[PDB]
Homo-oligomer: A and B are copies of this chain.
Amino acid sequence: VTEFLKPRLVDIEQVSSTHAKVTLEPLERGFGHTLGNALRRILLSSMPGCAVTEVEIDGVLHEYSTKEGVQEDILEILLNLKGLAVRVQGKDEVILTLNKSGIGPVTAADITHDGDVEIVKPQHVICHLTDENASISMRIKVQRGRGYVPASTRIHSEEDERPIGRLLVDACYSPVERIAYNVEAARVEQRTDLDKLVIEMETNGTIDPEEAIRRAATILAEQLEAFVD
């Protein structure tokens, strides 16, 4: 080591709720490249999250079919609503709900507010309505996954289940979506010129920047633990 000068988390700036630029302490030579690269890689690698996993909606029976009063297709509903992302508590595999009528635009806000989830933005799309008499009724099931789980990757889970009315779609299940490294060298006068690495992290807002960084670090440490042996 010989005064290895290990870096530490410091000067974390949140550009937005889902846009952030964080810093760390200066570190010795040769780690900054490795630190930044491994950080971007691990962070993008496995960021667990919650997302919409299976849909059971009263109206349609075949999503490749139309629906009176509604504008977008049922596949279009699945696509736009697939933009649903929400913070999830320790509870997993929950069922949120959303049912409403009217003639105004349909927003994500018109969803059943449970005690274990939080919708980040009221601005997502729920296939804005078209006719007064029509009433959309849906209940969206959310699961907690680490990465993209294919539509037929979940096929084997249902042998006698999944009736026509309950269907599955695809997802990403990783709120990270951005991790990048930029190493500079500053704030080093008392000792040799050390390097501080700035991390640009733009998560889905579901995971906090420092918390996610800590989780990734713990994963990396767990990995390196066997490497000694």
List residues of A whose CB falls within 8 A of some B CB. 1-2, 4, 6-7, 10, 27-31, 33-35, 37-39, 41-42, 45-46, 48, 144-146, 215, 219, 222-227, 229
A28 contacts across to B, CB distance below 8 A: 45-46
* B1→A223 contact, CB < 8 A: no
* CB-based contact B45/A41 at 8 Å: no
Q: Which 10 A-B pairs have the closest CB atoms?
A: A30-B45, A34-B41, A38-B38, A1-B48, A34-B38, A30-B46, A6-B226, A34-B42, A31-B45, A7-B226
CB distance from A153 to the nearest CB of B (A): 15
Q: Please tell me how many copies of the chain the complex holds.
A: 2
Nearest Cβ in chain B — how far from A226, in angstroms?
5
Please give, as numbers and ranges, the residues of chain B lying within 8 Å of A222 by CB-CB distance: 4, 6
Min distance, Cβ A44 to any Cβ of chain B, angstroms: 8
Query: Given the complex, which residues of B lie within 8 Å of A219, measured CB to CB?
Result: 2, 4
Closest to A1 in B: B48
CB-defined contacts of A7 to chain B, threshold 8 Å:
226
Given contact pairs A1-B146, A31-B45, A46-B4, A37 touches B37 in the complex (Cβ within 8 A) = yes
14 extra interface residue pairs, beta carbon distance < 8 Å, beyond A29-B45, A35-B223, A37-B41 = A1-B48, A4-B46, A6-B222, A6-B223, A6-B225, A6-B226, A10-B226, A27-B223, A31-B41, A31-B223, A35-B224, A37-B37, A37-B38, A38-B38
Q: How far is the CB of A218 from chain B (nearest CB, A)?
A: 8
Contact A215 B30 (CB under 8 A): no
- A46 to B48 alpha-carbon distance, docked (Å): 33
Contact check, A46 vs B29: say whether CB atoms are below 8 A apart: yes
